[PDB]
């Protein structure tokens, strides 16, 4: 949760220091807007998919359920790109730089000289740049406001729709699940604790095996006090074979034994 | 990981203090741009290849797998030059200094006097310099913006493609590998621990051998308390012969013994 | 490594406080540039050769291998002069002060009055000085930029070539060496430890011999607590003869005993 | 070594506060320059010769080797005057104040009125002073630069030659010496330790003898705790006769006993 | 040594606060200069002779050797007046105030009106004062510089001659002395230690005698803890007669007993 | 010694805050100068004579030697008034305010109108005041300088003569004295210690007698812890009679007993 | 002594804050001056007489010697008023405000219009006030200076006479006294100690008697720890009768018993 706030502060500082620079020219406008606003979205989406464990379980499985699996992964990923997109929409100055060229020159009330010529769409496109002829500046301000309107409106609608989707995926997960409400919280706690304990234990065991391997070369290994106590307590011979390592990996759907429940593939293997 | 951030801050400060100085002249423009933007790329690439262990294993081996080996080394190296290149593209003011000369004088809308003469490409090339005749300055601003556009666009496209390549090499490594997903993490932990323990132990053993050699000369060696305890605990005679040292070095593909796995050449040698 | 950074900071401060003062006159220009930019290079090269142990081993030996010996010494020396030279080239304002006089007066586009006279090469040479006649200043700026171009270009090319040479000498040392890759790192650790232990022990032994010599004069020597414990622990009679001291000094190529390796001449002497 | 840096900082502050004041007059120029720049050189040279032990050994001896003895003393002395001289040359404003008068009035290109008259060498000599007639100031600047050129050039050449001489005396000492390379370092350590121990012991012994002499007068001496422990530990009768004191002083060339080496005259006397 | 530095700082602050005020008038100039620059010299010389022990030994003796005795005393005294004199010469503004009147009015090149009249030597003498008529000021500056020249030149020559005399008296003391080089350093250490111990012991003994005298009056003396321990340890009866006190005082030339040396008159008396 | 420095700082601050205010009028000038500069001299002289012990010994004696006694007292007194007098002379602005009136109006070179009239001595006397008529101011400055000259000259001559007298009284005391040189220093130490011990003991004894007297009134005295220990240790009956007190006071010339010396009248009385 | 310095600082601050305000009017001038300068003198004199013990002894006695008694008291009192008076005289601006009216209008040299009229003594008296008519101001300054002259002169003469009187009363006390010089110092120490001990003991005894009186009322007294220990140690019955208290008070001339001296009336009573 806090990592999300750190990423949000980082995205704010990145928007501040990335210096969005709107080119004013007929065709390149919306192209540059689209790219500059949606490429970091793709980058953050890819990072989200990368730093998630579930996707690697899914790909290892390849060698109704898929719905909820993909839902979990795509949500935990798309948390951040939507944040960046709405922060960029609310600020404006990206939507207007894109859709400035399409502002209809005819239909907008102002002082005289409604719009000069057909060739003038270009000086229309320049509107996001300073581009302030006396005959234009006030007429121009109108377009800036009328575009920032649509930008911020889409931003607020997007925030609303994201909230509605979060609430609906919540209210739909529970109503369609075999487990009760509290058993799932217990399951999540168990999963986190198992992950942490397994990582730490695998590290200690690996270090002990490496110490044995080294000592078999020189005649003595060199350790700190911590590692000394470690190799004093835990002996080690050699890790389990590859089939065992394979039985652990994968995705796990909640399976019950005769009466008792099984909360993970490691659990399923510890019993049999 | 943190070293990458330190190198990034160093690259930022180096760009700030290196003082890119765009010469304005017809031919030298893109030459100077290419060199000043792509020579430090070569330097950082070379440093990356130098400070990597895997490449020296590869060259010691010379005395499908090569694909993944070269992939690992070239990625761990080219992390930094791509960073420098994109930081230089996003800033602009390098792409425009290069491709200013090629801006077509005919096709760009502005005030009267579209473009003076054929000899004027030179005063065109001067555009990145101050070079602001009253007949030109406003017409010039157009070229600056239109070039910074293409620069930042290529920068964003490059960031996107780099992200896509990272994600694809990830998703392709796992899907084509004999091991499971978690066994590889255990393998990486074991490799790091073995490297650290081997380095420290080799240092202690060398110091002990040197102390023996010295003491055989004067009649007594001089030590601190630390070294005193060291020579008190660990005796030493003489390091293993050269064939043994040779059996350790090299690149290692995952080989299994009868059932049990072998996680490194040192491990492979400790058993037999 | 850190000493190199300290020397770099010192070179920067020395360039800041040495006050390069470009004389503007026809012949003296490139002479002063050459001297002021390449004499401290010679000084730093000489210091590098002086503060290196290997060269004194080489000269004591005088009373294919020489290739690598000279390579090691010349590299560990020429680390610094190349740094100073490239820092001076990138700044410019030394190359232009040298090669200002040779700027061809004919071929450089500008306003009217291309170049006044044959006697005017002198007012050409003055270009690095203020020397700003209204008929000249703008025409002059061109030469300053066109020269700083070549200066910084040579600087970047030099950095690139130095990086390439570092990488090639690395990749050529390993591929042509009897030892493995890791045995050489162990060798370097042993060499450093032997040097440190030998220096400290020789100092303690010398101090003890001096204390004996003194005490034989007055009737009692005067010591601190440290020296008291020293003379309490380590007795001393008299240092080994001169042939023994001679067997230690020199350059050492990796020689193997029957099976076991010998890592230094001191080691070679401790066995026999 | 650090004392050299302290002396350098002191020389810098002394140059800052000594206020070199160039008189502008025909004959007195180079006289004042020579004196003010080379008298403190003589002072520092004399101080260097005074604070060196070796010279007093040499003079006590008077009551091929002399080459190296004089070399050691003259180098350890002339370390500082060369530093002062080069710091004064690089700054300029001393060489120009000396050789201003000799600047040939004919051969130096400038505006009209090349040089007024024969009597004008005087207003030439005034050039280091403000002395700025409108007909002269610009013509004058030329002479200032052309002289500072030669000054800084001689300074850099002097630094280079000093470095070359240091390197050559180094490379010539070792190649022509009976000892090995490392035995000389051991010798230097022994010499320093012997000097320190002898000084401290002579002081303690003198204080004890003085305490005995005093106590024989009043009936009791008065001491601190330190001196109390001193007179408690070390008894004293009376220092050795004058011939013994004489056998210690002098210069010592490396003499070998039957096999074993002798590292100082005190050592030579402790054996026999 | 440090006391010399404190006296130097005091002399600097005294020169700063004493406010040398040059009167401009024909005859009084050099008189005031001579007095104000050479009377504090006499004062410092007298203080030096006063605070030296050797001179009182010399005068008590009155009730080749005298050469070295007077040399020691006159040097240890004249250390400071020469310092003050050279600090006053280098600053100038004292020599010029003295010898302004003697500046020959005829021989000094300048603008027209070489020198007005015979009565004008007076307005010449005024030169150190502001005294700036338009017809004079520039002509005057010449005299100020030409006089400060001679002042600083004499100052530097004096520093040089003082250094030469120091070096020659050093090199002449040793070459003509019965003792060796190191025995004299031992002698100096013994002299300092004897002086300190004798002073402290005489003080303690005097205080004890005074305590006895007092206690014989009231019936009890009053003491601190320190004095309590003092009178507890050291008894006292009455100081030695006057002939003994006389045998101690005087000047001592190095006299040898049969074999052993005698380092002071107190030593000479302790034996017999 | 330090008290002299404190008195000097106090005299400086007193001169700063006493606000010497020179009245300009014919007769009152030198009167006010004499008084204001020589009355605090008398005050400091009187204080010096008051705070000296020796003078009271001299006056108690009244109920060649007298030469040295008066010398000691008059010197220890006149230390300070001479300091004040020379500090006042060096500053000037007191001598000129006194002897302004006597400046001969005829003999002083300046501009025209040498001196107006006989009645003008008054406007002459006003010279130390602002009193600056255009016809006078410059002519006046001359008199100020010419008088400050004589003032500072007398000040320096006085300092010199005081130094000479100090040195001569020193060199004459020793040469004419029965004692040796060191015995007198021992004598001075004994005198100081006797004075201190006698004062402290007399105070303690008086307090004890007072406590006895009080306790005989109420029935119990009230004490601190310090006084408690005092009355616990030292009993007291009643001070010695008046003849004994008389035998102690007076001036003492060095008298010898049969062999042994007697260093004070208290000592002389303790023996008999 | 320190109380005198505190009173002096207080007098300075009181003079600063009392705001002497000179009225300018013919008759009231010297009246106001006299009062404002001599009434605080009377106040300080009265305070001095009040806070002195000796005067109350003198008045209790009423129910050649009187000379010295009155001398002691009047001196210890008039210490402060003389200080205030001289501090007021040296500042001036009080004497001039008093004796302005008496300045003879005829005899004072200045510009024309010597003094206007007989009625003008009034505008004369106004001189200490601003009162600066153009015809007067400069003529006025003369009177201010001429009066401040006499003021400061009387101040310095008063300081001198006070010093002379102090010295003469000192030199006359000793020469005419039965006691020796040191016995009087012992007497003063005894007097101070007796006063302090008697005061403290009387306080403790009074508090104990009061505690007994109280406890006889309620049945128990309430005390601190200090008072608890007090009433634990010292019992009390009732103070001595009134004749005894009377025998203690009074003035005491030095009376001798048969041989032994008696230093106070309390002492005289403790014996009999």
Can you give the residue ranges of every domain in chain F?
Answer: 1-272
Query: Rounded to an integer, what distance in angstroms lies between the CA atom of residue E55 and that of residue E246?
Result: 17
Q: Which residues pair with E262 in a beta bridge?
A: E255
Q: What share of chain F is helix, strand, coil (3-state, %, to 5)?
A: 70, 0, 30
CB E136 within 8 A of CB E68: no
The structure tokens listed for E113 are 């009106």
CB contact under 8 A, D204 and C222: yes
Instruction: Kindly list the residues from chain B whose CB atom is less than 8 angstroms away from the CB atom of residue A245.
Output: 179-180, 182-183
Measured between CA atoms, the residue of chain C closest to residue D193 is C207
Nearest by CB to residue C23, choosing from D109, D146, D270, is: D146
Instruction: Kindly list the residues from chain B whose CB atom is less than 8 angstroms away from the CB atom of residue C269.
Output: 217
Query: Rounded to an integer, what distance in angstroms lies between the CA atom of residue D207 and that of residue D218?
Result: 17
CB contact under 8 A, F244 and E209: no
Per DSSP, the three-state class of E230 is helix
Query: Rounded to an integer, what distance in angstroms lies between the CA atom of residue G204 and that of residue A105?
Result: 109
CB of E261 within 8 Å of a chain D CB? The answer is yes
How does strand G261-262 pair with strand G255-256?
Answer: antiparallel
Query: Rounded to an integer, what distance in angstroms lies between the CA atom of residue E162 and that of residue E159?
Result: 5
Measured between CA atoms, the residue of chain C closest to residue B59 is C175
* DSSP letter assigned to residue G27: T
Query: Rounded to an integer, what distance in angstroms lies between the CA atom of residue D77 and that of residue D41?
Result: 11
Nearest by CB to residue F189, choosing from E202, E222, E238, is: E202
* DSSP letter assigned to residue D169: H
The structure tokens listed for E153 are 């030149």
Instruction: Kindly list the residues from chain B whose CB atom is less than 8 angstroms away from the CB atom of residue A209.
Output: 190, 263, 267
Candidates A27, A217, A245: best to mutate against B (most CBs of B within 10 A) is A217
Instruction: Kindly list the residues from chain A whose CB atom is less than 8 angstroms away from the CB atom of residue B159.
Output: 39-40, 43
Query: Rounded to an integer, what distance in angstroms lies between the CA atom of residue A6 and that of residue B115?
Result: 51
Name subunits touching A (3+ CB pairs < 8 A).
Answer: B
CB A194 within 8 A of CB A129: no
Name the nearest CA neighbour of A94 among A138, A47, A154, A34. Answer: A34
Contacts of E253 (CB under 8 A, 6+ apart): E65
Buried residues in E220-257 as b, exposed as e (16+ CB within 10 A): bbbbeeebeebbeebebeebbebeebbebbeeeeeeee
Instruction: Kindly list the residues from chain D whose CB atom is less than 8 angstroms away from the CB atom of residue E147.
Output: none
Three-state SS sequence of chain A: CHHHHHHHHHHHHHHHHHCCCCCCCCCHHHHHHHHHHHHHHHHHHHHHHHCCHHHHHHHHHHCCHHHHHHHHHHHHHHHHHHHHHHHHHHCCCCHHHHHCCCCCCCCCCCCCCCCCCCCCHHHHHCCCCCCCCCCCHHHHHHHHHHHHHHHHHHHHHHHHHHHHHHHHHHHHHHHCCCCCCHHHHHHHHHHHHHHHHHHHHHHHHHHHHHHHHHHHHHCCCCCCHHHHHHHHHCCCCCCCCHHHHHHHCCCCCCEECCCCEECCHHHHHHHC
Nearest by CB to residue B260, choosing from A59, A217, A238, is: A238
Measured between CA atoms, the residue of chain F closest to residue G170 is F50
Name the nearest CA neighbour of A72 among A58, A61, A83. Answer: A58
Q: Please report where in the chains the tokens 């010029």 appear, as a residue.
A: E96
CB of G250 within 8 Å of a chain F CB? The answer is no
The structure tokens listed for C227 are 């020296």
CB contact under 8 A, B153 and A122: no
CB contact under 8 A, C166 and B207: no
The structure tokens listed for C96 are 């232009």
The structure tokens listed for D50 are 């005074």
CB B100 within 8 A of CB B124: yes
Cα three-residue angle B102-B104-B107, rounded to 5 degrees: 160
Per DSSP, the three-state class of G106 is coil
Query: Rounded to an integer, what distance in angstroms lies between the CA atom of residue E81 and that of residue D13?
Result: 23
Nearest by CB to residue G174, choosing from F56, F206, F207, is: F56
The structure tokens listed for D255 are 């003499």
CB of E207 within 8 Å of a chain F CB? The answer is yes
- Structural element, H or E, at residue B6: helix B2-18
Helices (H), E95-224: 95-99, 121-125, 137-175, 182-218
E179: number of CA atoms within 13 Å, CB side? 17
Q: What share of chain B is helix, strand, coil (3-state, %, to 5)?
A: 70, 0, 30
Method of elucidation: cryo-EM
Buried residues in B57-82 as b, exposed as e (16+ CB within 10 A): bbebeeeeeeeebeeebeebbbbbbb
As a whole number of angstroms, the longest Cα–Cα distance in chain C is 96
- Shortest alpha-carbon distance between residue F176 and chain G (Å): 30
Nearest by CB to residue E145, choosing from D23, D60, D211, is: D23
Per DSSP, the three-state class of B102 is coil
- Structural element, H or E, at residue F255: strand F255-256
């Amino acid at each position: 949760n806090g990592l999300v706030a750190l990423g949000t502060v980082g995205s704010q500082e990145l928007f501040s220091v990335v210096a969005f620079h709107c080119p004013c020219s007929p065709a390149r406008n919306y192209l540059y807007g689209l790219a500059a606003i949606g490429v970091p979205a793709l980058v953050l989406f890819i990072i989200g998919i990368i730093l998630n464990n579930h996707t690697w379980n899914l790909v290892a499985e390849c060698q109704a359920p898929t719905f909820l699996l993909l839902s979990s992964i795509l949500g935990r990923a798309a948390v951040a790109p939507v944040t960046w997109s709405v922060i960029s929409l609310l600020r404006g100055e990206a939507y207007v730089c894109a859709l400035s060229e399409f502002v209809d020159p005819s239909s907008l009330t102002a002082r005289e000289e409604h719009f000069p010529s057909a060739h003038a769409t270009e000086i229309l496109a320049r509107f996001p740049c300073k581009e302030n002829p006396d005959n234009l500046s006030d007429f121009r301000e109108e377009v800036s406001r009328r575009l920032r309107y649509e930008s911020q409106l889409f931003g607020w609608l997007l925030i609303g729709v994201v909230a509605i989707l979060v609430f609906l995926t919540k209210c739909l997960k529970h109503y369609c699940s075999p487990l009760s409400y509290r058993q799932e919280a217990y399951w999540a706690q168990y999963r986190a604790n198992e992950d942490q304990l397994f990582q730490r234990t695998a590290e200690v065991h690996s270090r002990v095996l490496a110490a044995n391997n080294v000592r078999r070369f020189f005649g003595f290994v060199a350790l700190n006090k911590d590692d000394e106590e470690l190799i004093a307590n835990f002996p080690v011979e050699g890790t389990q074979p590859r089939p065992q390592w394979n039985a652990i990996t994968g995705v796990y759907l909640y399976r019950e034994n005769q009466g008792l429940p099984l909360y993970s593939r490691l659990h399923k293997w510890a019993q049999g």
